[model samples]
Target: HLELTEEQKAKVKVHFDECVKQEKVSEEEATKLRNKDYANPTPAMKCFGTCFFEKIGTLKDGVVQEAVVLEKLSPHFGEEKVKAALDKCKNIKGADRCDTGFKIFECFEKAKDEL
Candidate 1:
């Protein structure tokens, strides 16, 4: 199972805050992720992808065009998992599986669902 040490959690919190500060992602958007159970890539991935994606998806037309890079980043899926997910996440136009670069929360959500 994924888990983060207290130090890791603190670092992650700082990183996420920076992303919000730098990107100007609205509080509501940040809150959606904040509300997620696992908002980290290393310890526990959050499961806010669908909601996060849905909101971001609405903000822009296509994933390729709409990809929003945050200033801060949480941990991510394992290297192999991430590579696989990216392969799927990168090419899709509207489909979920083909999408890549999911919000950290979304990653956890997916992991939970798959398990």
Candidate 2:
């Protein structure tokens, strides 16, 4: 798994925050996470967790899974930095393995917001 920094954590936190705002997660789940003191689950974390197990893990397994994902997306994105950023978003905790495209798109949306 990839270890993310504080700044990076904050970015993902924002994603989760947005998810809550948008009600992507059910109200009950959101309330449970918010009520927790530590490991307070965010929409981003839930998204990542959902992505990893349901999407990526179920699809393929290998040493270079990260590289493979990056390589696949690089063509359309056309930037190594963007690709790398995307990769980071993909492997983050709580991202579901399925809907990889949408997850990447979410990252792009976040990036676009920053830019």
**What range of 10 consecutive residues in model 1 has the weakest lDDT sum?**
65-74
Scored by lDDT, model 1 comes in at: 0.42
Q: TM-score, each model?
A: 0.40, 0.30
lDDT score at residue 2, model 1, on the 0-100 scale:
46
How many Å off is the CA of 85 in candidate 1? Answer: 6.9
Candidate 1 segments exceeding 4 Å error: 37-99, 103-115
**What's the TM for model 2?**
0.30
lDDT of 1 by residue, 23-103 (tens): 455666677557753334321122133333333332233343222322111233345544444444444443232133344
Best by TM-score: 1
* Candidate 2: Cα lDDT at 90: 52
Writing each residue's lDDT as its tens digit, candidate 2 over 7-28 gives 8567656755665555466667
lDDT of 1 at 43: 14
